[PDB]
Amino acid sequence: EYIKLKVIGQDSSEIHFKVKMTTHLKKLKESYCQRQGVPMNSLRFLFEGQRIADNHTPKELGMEEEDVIEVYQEQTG
Amino acid sequence: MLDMDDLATLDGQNWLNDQVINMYGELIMDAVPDKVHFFNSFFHRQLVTKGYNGVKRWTKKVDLFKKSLLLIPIHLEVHWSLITVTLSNRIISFYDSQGIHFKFCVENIRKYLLTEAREKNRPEFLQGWQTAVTKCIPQQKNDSDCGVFVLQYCKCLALEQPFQFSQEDMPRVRKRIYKELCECRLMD
């Protein structure tokens, strides 16, 4: 089955995905980065503060319908 | 995980990035998990732009108030600073190599702690908080080591070691941190 997921940036922009619950979120990270035209390695995807690994699933992380993934950009100082 | 472009930010006088900051904080918290909680460098930004409801679920599995010490790296766009919270004396402390941005940071965190104490039914933490400037970290003398001082202070406090370091030690500290992230192993 599919799961709807909101991917939200710090400007409050939302990209809505409908992905399989058993699929690696790496595919979603790639799609989001191409959407925004930035390198994937310069973004960080968090679910309730936890870093989302490439090999993670919505199912393994306990995501439910319309849950939110927060995105942050690389920070240097 | 880190890739070499993350670790490369420890070379020479490169500016450290959040992958270095956040993985090093997870090493520290793994060492003393029952005493320390390390918020990643995205917590303060999420708190600031999305309020408590933006970070409320980030403490899903965490009783903050059982810990001894909270470490909160603060990314100030082109600069790294650090908030520490010690729960015994209820002191919110701020370290920045120039003291810039003191008020907003400690107030952001104090407001957050009170809201959390209320939501998690810890009313013994609704009274007594005090803010402070961290005073005797040695002075940073260049334009690039703010992230290194921050991590060094994280490790000294979590592991209860004195800050016996100064600017001249910072190249060796970069090499140590680089080594520790490569091996995933804090050294003594």
From Swiss-Prot, chain A:
Coiled coil: none annotated. There is a cross-link at residues 4, 18, 20, 26-27 (Glycyl lysine isopeptide (Lys-Gly) (interchain with G-Cter in SUMO2)). Residues 1-77 form the Ubiquitin-like domain. Keywords: Acetylation, Cell membrane, Chromosomal rearrangement, Cytoplasm, Host-virus interaction, Isopeptide bond, Membrane, Nucleus, Phosphoprotein, Ubl conjugation, Ubl conjugation pathway. One of its GO terms (cellular component) is nuclear stress granule. It is found in: Nucleus membrane; Nucleus speckle; Cytoplasm; Nucleus, PML body. The record marks 17 as: Interaction with PIAS2. GO terms for biological process: cellular response to cadmium ion; cellular response to heat; DNA repair; negative regulation of action potential; negative regulation of delayed rectifier potassium channel activity; negative regulation of DNA binding; negative regulation of DNA-binding transcription factor activity; negative regulation of DNA-templated transcription. The modification Phosphoserine is found at residue 13. GO terms for molecular function: enzyme binding; potassium channel regulator activity; protein tag activity; RNA binding; small protein activating enzyme binding; transcription factor binding; transporter activator activity; ubiquitin protein ligase binding. There is a cross-link at residue 6 (Glycyl lysine isopeptide (Lys-Gly) (interchain with G-Cter in SUMO1)). Residues 1-6, 18-21 are annotated as: (Microbial infection) Interaction with Tula hantavirus. Its main location: nucleus. It comes from the Eukaryota. Cleavage of precursor form by SENP1 or SENP2 is necessary for function. Covalently attached to KCNB1; UBE2I increases cross-linking with KCNB1 and PIAS1 decreases cross-links with KCNB1. Interacts with SAE2, RANBP2, PIAS1 and PIAS2. Interacts with PRKN. Covalently attached to a number of proteins such as IKFZ1, PML, RANGAP1, HIPK2, SP100, p53, p73-alpha, MDM2, JUN, DNMT3B and TDG. Also interacts with HIF1A, HIPK2, HIPK3, CHD3, EXOSC9, RAD51 and RAD52. Interacts with USP25 (via ts SIM domain); the interaction weakly sumoylates USP25. Interacts with SIMC1, CASP8AP2, RNF111 and SOBP (via SIM domains). Interacts with BHLHE40/DEC1. Interacts with RWDD3. It is linked to Non-syndromic orofacial cleft 10: A birth defect consisting of cleft lips with or without cleft palate. Cleft lips are associated with cleft palate in two-third of cases. A cleft lip can occur on one or both sides and range in severity from a simple notch in the upper lip to a complete opening in the lip extending into the floor of the nostril and involving the upper gum. Ubiquitin-like protein that can be covalently attached to proteins as a monomer or a lysine-linked polymer. Covalent attachment via an isopeptide bond to its substrates requires prior activation by the E1 complex SAE1-SAE2 and linkage to the E2 enzyme UBE2I, and can be promoted by E3 ligases such as PIAS1-4, RANBP2 or CBX4. This post-translational modification on lysine residues of proteins plays a crucial role in a number of cellular processes such as nuclear transport, DNA replication and repair, mitosis and signal transduction. Belongs to the ubiquitin family. SUMO subfamily.
From Swiss-Prot, chain B:
Residues 1-157 are annotated as: Protease. Changing residue 146 to A: Abolishes enzymatic activity. It is found in: Nucleus, Nucleolus. The active site is at residues 79, 96, 146. Protease that catalyzes two essential functions in the SUMO pathway: processing of full-length SUMO3 to its mature form and deconjugation of SUMO2 and SUMO3 from targeted proteins. Has weak proteolytic activity against full-length SUMO1 or SUMO1 conjugates. Required for cell division. Belongs to the peptidase C48 family. Interacts with CCAR2. This is Sentrin-specific protease 5. It comes from Homo sapiens. The chain holds residues 568 to 755 of 755 of the full protein.
